[PDB]
Design an enzyme around this catalytic site. Structure first.
Site, PDB file in Angstrom:
ATOM      1  N   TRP B  63      33.497  14.122  49.543  1.00  0.00           N
ATOM      2  CA  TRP B  63      32.794  15.339  49.140  1.00  0.00           C
ATOM      3  C   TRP B  63      32.573  15.373  47.612  1.00  0.00           C
ATOM      4  O   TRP B  63      32.922  16.346  46.929  1.00  0.00           O
ATOM      5  CB  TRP B  63      33.544  16.577  49.654  1.00  0.00           C
ATOM      6  N   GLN B  79      12.440  28.699  58.625  1.00  0.00           N
ATOM      7  CA  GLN B  79      12.915  28.870  59.991  1.00  0.00           C
ATOM      8  C   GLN B  79      13.330  30.321  60.301  1.00  0.00           C
ATOM      9  O   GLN B  79      14.524  30.642  60.300  1.00  0.00           O
ATOM     10  CB  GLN B  79      14.079  27.888  60.226  1.00  0.00           C
ATOM     11  N   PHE B  80      12.353  31.191  60.583  1.00  0.00           N
ATOM     12  CA  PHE B  80      12.637  32.622  60.819  1.00  0.00           C
ATOM     13  C   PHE B  80      13.627  32.862  61.955  1.00  0.00           C
ATOM     14  O   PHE B  80      14.353  33.863  61.963  1.00  0.00           O
ATOM     15  CB  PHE B  80      11.348  33.441  61.040  1.00  0.00           C
ATOM     16  N   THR B  81      13.667  31.925  62.895  1.00  0.00           N
ATOM     17  CA  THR B  81      14.573  32.012  64.030  1.00  0.00           C
ATOM     18  C   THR B  81      16.046  32.103  63.605  1.00  0.00           C
ATOM     19  O   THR B  81      16.921  32.404  64.409  1.00  0.00           O
ATOM     20  CB  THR B  81      14.360  30.825  64.977  1.00  0.00           C
TER      21      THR B  81
HETATM   22  N1  LIG Z   1      33.714  12.807  59.027  1.00  0.00           N
HETATM   23  C1  LIG Z   1      32.628  12.198  59.517  1.00  0.00           C
HETATM   24  N2  LIG Z   1      32.793  11.396  60.565  1.00  0.00           N
HETATM   25  N3  LIG Z   1      31.402  12.366  58.985  1.00  0.00           N
HETATM   26  C2  LIG Z   1      31.069  13.208  57.835  1.00  0.00           C
HETATM   27  C3  LIG Z   1      31.345  12.598  56.459  1.00  0.00           C
HETATM   28  C4  LIG Z   1      32.696  13.113  55.966  1.00  0.00           C
HETATM   29  C5  LIG Z   1      33.188  12.399  54.705  1.00  0.00           C
HETATM   30  N4  LIG Z   1      32.968  13.264  53.501  1.00  0.00           N
HETATM   31  C6  LIG Z   1      34.628  11.919  54.822  1.00  0.00           C
HETATM   32  O1  LIG Z   1      34.878  10.730  55.057  1.00  0.00           O
HETATM   33  O2  LIG Z   1      35.603  12.670  54.671  1.00  0.00           O
END
Ligand SMILES: NC(=[NH2+])NCCC[C@@H](N)C(=O)O
Lengths: 149, 151
Positions: B63, B79-81
């Protein structure tokens, strides 16, 4: 619990890449499970996914549901839906249910989807695994529901 | 304002026999819902997070990197939905969604700002109001939801 519902011409779901699930017309449902969710939270999501009238029945808009047209559902579990992004730019997943407890809850949810509709019509992923999903979005039609309302 | 952000390896948008009008490779698809009482501060918050949320890994770190850091793209689709109310009944109703004629003004304002706050060539769009088909390669998948009215 939280759910993002998208309407598809089809979806192909693959893991590290080999296709392991597939559906034609119907719904992809990203299903995030809040850590305090009750079996009543589940039922609300299932009732809603199976019953929501999201298709034009030729000439009358918002009329037919997944069961009505005999369509399919792919349920993907998305804990990232409890990524709080109000603090920084690093989403924090502290409201999300713990992975193990979550798998047990997720399963039951799938059983019930099968019990409520049809068990050949319900597809899944590999719970806590990297997935790759080619989704054909029809509309597109996105629907959000947090059951804590 | 309401947004659903999905991480993608790519995306291909087509409108009505189908014609392709938009493509992105790696980056974010952003289903953008515009509330009746949205102000510009609601919009900026949307634009900010999409550009600045770190939805990608890098080395050790998770992240850690945002769409810009990787020179990735965005595809913004109204996307109004998203204001489809489902508290009462199984038919969705959109009374909370903004009016199409102004939504369109608001959405463009927003698109310009999306270019202004990043790069002109990295922002792809839909065709507002019109029916669309969209192929999305969901990477993860990674779904983020933001409702600005929580702020
Ligand atoms: N977790 C997953 N399979 N896919 C989403 C990517 C998450 C990634 N930041 C991580 O490796 O934490």
């Amino acid at each position: 619990m939280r759910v993002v519902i998208q309407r598809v011409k089809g979806a192909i779901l693959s893991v590290r890449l080999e296709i392991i699930s597939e559906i034609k017309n119907g719904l992809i449902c990203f299903l995030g499970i809040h850590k305090n969710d009750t079996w009543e939270d589940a039922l609300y999501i299932i009732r809603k996914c199976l019953n929501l009238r999201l298709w034009n029945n030729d000439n009358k808009t918002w009329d037919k549901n997944v069961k009505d047209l005999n369509y399919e559902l792919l349920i993907v579990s998305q804990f990232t839906l409890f990524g709080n992004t109000k603090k920084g730019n690093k989403p924090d997943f502290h409201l999300a249910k713990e992975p193990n407890e979550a798998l047990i809850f997720y399963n039951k949810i799938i059983d019930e989807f099968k019990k409520q509709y049809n068990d050949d019509k319900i597809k899944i992923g590999k719970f806590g695994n990297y997935m790759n999903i080619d989704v054909t979005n029809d509309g597109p039609v996105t629907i959000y529901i947090d059951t804590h309302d």
